[PDB]
Structure formats: C-alpha cells, structure tokens
Design an enzyme around this catalytic site. Structure first.
Site, short mmCIF file in Angstrom:
data_model
loop_
_atom_site.label_atom_id
_atom_site.label_comp_id
_atom_site.label_asym_id
_atom_site.label_seq_id
_atom_site.Cartn_x
_atom_site.Cartn_y
_atom_site.Cartn_z
N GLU A 212 0.83 -1.20 0.00
CA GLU A 212 0.00 0.00 0.00
C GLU A 212 0.86 1.26 0.00
OE1 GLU A 212 -2.78 0.14 3.25
OE2 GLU A 212 -3.46 2.16 2.77
N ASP A 214 0.33 5.04 0.57
CA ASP A 214 -0.56 6.11 1.01
C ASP A 214 0.04 7.46 0.64
OD1 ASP A 214 -2.51 4.36 2.12
OD2 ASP A 214 -1.21 4.10 3.86
N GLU A 217 -3.05 10.99 3.08
CA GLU A 217 -4.07 10.80 4.10
C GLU A 217 -4.09 12.08 4.93
OE1 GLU A 217 -2.53 6.75 5.51
OE2 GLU A 217 -4.72 6.52 5.54
N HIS A 228 3.82 1.56 2.54
CA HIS A 228 3.76 0.32 3.33
C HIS A 228 4.25 -0.86 2.48
CE1 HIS A 228 0.78 1.77 6.51
NE2 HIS A 228 0.61 2.68 5.56
#
Ligand SMILES: *[C@@H]1O[C@H](CO)[C@@H](O[C@@H]2O[C@H](CO)[C@@H](O)[C@H](O)[C@H]2NC(C)=O)[C@H](O)[C@H]1NC(C)=O
Ligand SMILES: *[C@@H]1O[C@H](CO)[C@@H](O)[C@H](O)[C@H]1NC(C)=O
Ligand SMILES: *[C@@H]1O[C@H](CO)[C@@H](O)[C@H](O)[C@H]1NC(C)=O
Length: 438
Positions: A212, A214, A217, A228
């Site tokens: 993942e 990101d 956010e 991640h």
C-alpha cells in the site's frame, strides 16, 4: 460475487492528465467505480438481500463459496445514495448522505474502461493533484492512495467472481482488512461478527493483504505520506489474527507492514507548516506533488513532496526531530525515524523500498476515499498525543492539534455531517513535468 441486473451501473466520468518531459499534457477519459462493500448485495433470483446492515442471510450464504454463487452486487446511485459527484477533472466525496438510508463515507477506484482499473507504475515519475480539505475537521481522513489490486478485479482466475472491477471488487491493503464481504472470489460470511460500534460493518474469518502506497491521508489539521511494504506485493488471503494489522490481537505478526514509513510534518516537529492559515493553508485548495526517484538500476530510493498554493512552489518541511533530518522519505530517514521514535520497523521487515518498487512494477490501482476511524478515531493522524496516554514531550507522540477525545464516529457522524473532500486535476508524468510556480 455475481453481476446484479436490477440497477444500471454507470461509472461517473473523470478526466486526468498525462504529461511528458516538455511540460505538455494530454487528457485521459477515466471513470470512477464504487468499492463493492458499499453496494446492495442480493440474490441472483430476486431482490432478497444476501446482507443487510451488519448481518448476512445464512440461507443465501451458508458458506463462503455458495454465498459467492448466490449473491449479486448491483448498480449504485453515486450522488443520491453515496454523495459522490464527478465533474470534469473533479471528484467530490461527501462524508454523510441521508437519502432513503444513512451512508457514511466511500471508497472509489479510477477505471481505464468499464471492466478494468487503471494501473500505475510511478518509478521515475510524479503523481500530482489538487485537493480541498477545508471541509475536513478532526477525525476525518480524505485518502488518495494506491494498492496493487488486479486490474480486472480478480475475474480471470476467480470463477465465482463475475462482478469484478466493474463493481469495485478486489480491494486489498496493508492492514489485511477482514471487513470485506468478498475476498479473492469467495464471500467472507464464515466467521463473520457484526461490529460492536458501526451499524454497517463487521469482520469475517479472512483478510485481504497487499502492499500500500498512502500518497495522501489528511484533513484540515494534519497530513501524512506513508508507503507500506509487504512480503508479497499483490493480494494474498490470511485467516484471523495471523493476518496482523489493526483488528488483529498481534498487530505485527502478519505478512504486511501496517505502520509504514510515514512523513507527517507535524509529527516530524514542524507545527507551523500544514494546517489552517499555515504555510500550506488548509482553508484553500492546494496542489500536492509526490515524486518517486530511483537509483541507477530503476529501484525506488526516495519519495519527495512539493506543494503548490497561490502560485508558490513550497518544498516539504524539514523534519526537526533530533536524529531525524531531511524532508523526504529515504532508507536513511526511515531507519532513523523508527529508531528515534522507538517504533517497530515493519517497513524494513517486509522489504521496504524494494517492496514498493515491486508494487509499482506489478501495477498500482488509484484509490480515492473518505472515512472515519472506528478503531483509533484518526488520532494517529491528528491527535496531540497518540497513544492518548503517551507523553507529548516524547518525539513521535504528537501528530496534530486535535484533542484525545476527538474523532469518535458516533460524535462526528453527527457534528461533521456536512464534511467533504474534493480531489481534482490529477496529472502524471516525468519528474517536474506536472507543475510549475514561483
Ligand atoms: C475463510 O475463513 C473461514 C473462517 O475462519 C475459514 O473457515 C474455516 O475453515 C476451516 C478449514 O477448512 C474449518 O476447519 C472451519 O470449520 C472453518 N471455520 C468456519 C467458521 O467456517 C476458511 O478456511 C477461510 N478461507 C481461506 C481460504 O483461508
Ligand atoms: C434469507 O433468504 C431467504 C431466501 O431468499 C429468504 O426466504 C429469507 O426470508 C431470508 N431470511 C432473512 C432473515 O432475511
Ligand atoms: C525538479 O524541481 C525541483 C523543485 O524545484 C528541483 O529541486 C529539482 O532540481 C528538479 N529536478 C529535476 C530532475 O528537474
């Protein structure tokens, strides 16, 4: 899951741009698709629900396979039911929509055509977009991010998955989420228990793991950029607590990295940089540039961040924490940040930069969402202290200006009912091709 036939599924058009070295950009005709968990799920034989609120119908779904055979995902009224509206290059997501029923949040994916997600490999490229977070108070997360979901939604090797990408099937991420109704072409009715707090969710026996990225956010208070890693970058299925991640009893026991290597300007010691009236002023729209630099062999080695607002190009803020310098995500920063904060380096444990390189080569799907957090009230993103009982003098504890009692869903789903986010003007291309300014 099957294809429902009672409601037309029409993916709202959304344009985005591809730029080349010279600075010239052309326009792509994309479409957005709602994630399968938000949809009406009913029998293939009529209108009887396979699932309602937080509970499965066990006659239609006595096991994970038969459920998948019997149950169909149907079309969505994007604006009327989910508060999702796309216009030109702009995607707006509303937090709460009171139509015939109550809906909270959404998760959407960018499509190339009506049966395939668009995929991205951003190595030696940048991803850039405009955002308005002025309508996002404490506890909300407008997330724009990427995960290596299968482009077709899994249909090519999942015989009971006909709905696929057309109905937003196939989600996975670094928490190995078990709240998904359908994972890898099977239902998740087995082991399902309704959530203790959320009327519209639960957790099943299995979870959906992958890497993942990101990219974004954030709310009006704080923002975080967090890659991640994962052992296997594409989807894998896990069972119960061995999944790891948020709703596991042993967070770090799984095959993915649930914490990532994060850069939140506030958590890195600069409280003057991002927020209301700050250098990046969350009262107004701004551009977010994220660049993915490589070594001589094409492996990811640095993620840089720039902002553009009011014509000015704004470098990312320097981390001011003693022992954690620089304004970008590199192996040196990640190593230093985990060591100094005293956090477990699961980022490194599951492959770090090489893992993210592999994620991009597999192809990333773009996700755009808006949610509240039933697990931690988004305190990890915006709280004066996380954990809430930790000492705010300790580096890494403070992440924002929000109180330790902020962001409780039962509170904010009422008090922040007007909340929304707008993502717009997506541009992808070589480094420095997608933006300009003083
Ligand atoms: C999905 O999760 C369910 C629930 O944990 C798993 O179902 C269990 O399967 C084992 C092995 O066949 C059985 O002994 C149990 O009786 C099942 N439990 C329940 C509650 O039904 C299932 O194995 C998981 N799927 C995958 C692919 O791992
Ligand atoms: C479950 O589905 C069956 C078959 O359609 C239906 O007859 C029954 O009413 C449903 N049960 C519940 C509790 O909704
Ligand atoms: C791109 O732009 C940034 C910000 O102005 C600058 O620091 C960097 O030198 C540029 N790099 C390239 C490869 O053009």
């Amino acid at each position: 899951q099957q294809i429902g036939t009672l409601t037309t599924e029409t993916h709202p058009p959304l344009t985005w741009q591809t730029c080349t070295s010279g600075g010239s950009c052309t326009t792509n005709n994309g479409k957005v698709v709602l994630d399968a968990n938000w949809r009406w799920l009913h029998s293939t034989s009529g209108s009887t629900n396979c699932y309602t609120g937080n509970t499965w119908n066990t006659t239609l779904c006595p096991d994970d396979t038969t459920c998948a055979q019997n149950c169909a995902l149907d079309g969505a009224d994007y604006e009327g039911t989910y508060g999702i509206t796309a216009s030109g290059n702009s995607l707006r997501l509303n937090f709460v929509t009171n139509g015939s029923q109550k809906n909270v949040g959404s998760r959407t994916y960018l499509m190339k055509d009506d049966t395939h997600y668009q995929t991205f490999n951003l190595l030696n490229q940048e991803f850039t977009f405009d955002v308005d977070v002025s309508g996002l108070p404490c506890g909300l997360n407008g997330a724009l991010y990427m995960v290596p979901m299968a482009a077709d939604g899994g249909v090519s090797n999942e015989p009971n998955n006909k709905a696929g990408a057309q109905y937003g099937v196939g989600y996975c991420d670094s928490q190995c989420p078990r709240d998904l109704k359908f994972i890898a072409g099977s239902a998740n009715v087995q082991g399902w228990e309704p959530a203790s707090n959320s009327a519209n969710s639960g957790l099943g026996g299995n979870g959906s793991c992958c890497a993942e990225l990101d990219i974004w956010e954030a709310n009006s208070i704080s923002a975080a950029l967090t890659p991640h890693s994962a052992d296997t970058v594409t989807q894998t299925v896990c069972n119960g607590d061995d999944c790891g991640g948020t709703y596991s009893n042993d967070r770090y026991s799984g095959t993915t990295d649930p914490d990532g290597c994060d850069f939140n300007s506030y958590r890195q010691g600069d409280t003057s940089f991002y927020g209301p009236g700050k250098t990046v002023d969350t009262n107004s729209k701004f551009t977010v540039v994220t660049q993915f630099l490589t070594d001589s062999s094409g492996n990811l080695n640095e993620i840089k961040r720039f902002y553009v607002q009011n014509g000015v190009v704004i470098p990312n803020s320097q981390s001011t924490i003693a022992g954690i310098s620089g304004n970008s995500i590199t192996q040196d920063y990640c190593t230093a940040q985990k060591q100094v904060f005293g956090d477990t380096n699961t980022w490194e444990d599951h492959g770090g930069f090489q893992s993210m390189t592999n994620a991009f080569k597999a192809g990333m799907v773009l996700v755009m969402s808006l949610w509240d957090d039933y697990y931690a009230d988004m305190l990890w993103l915006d709280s004066v202290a996380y954990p809430t009982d930790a000492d705010p003098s300790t580096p890494g504890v403070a992440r924002g200006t929000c109180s330790t009692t902020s962001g409780v869903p039962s509170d904010i789903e009422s008090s922040a009912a007007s909340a929304y986010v707008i993502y717009s003007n997506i541009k992808v291309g070589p480094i420095n091709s997608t933006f300009s300014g003083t």
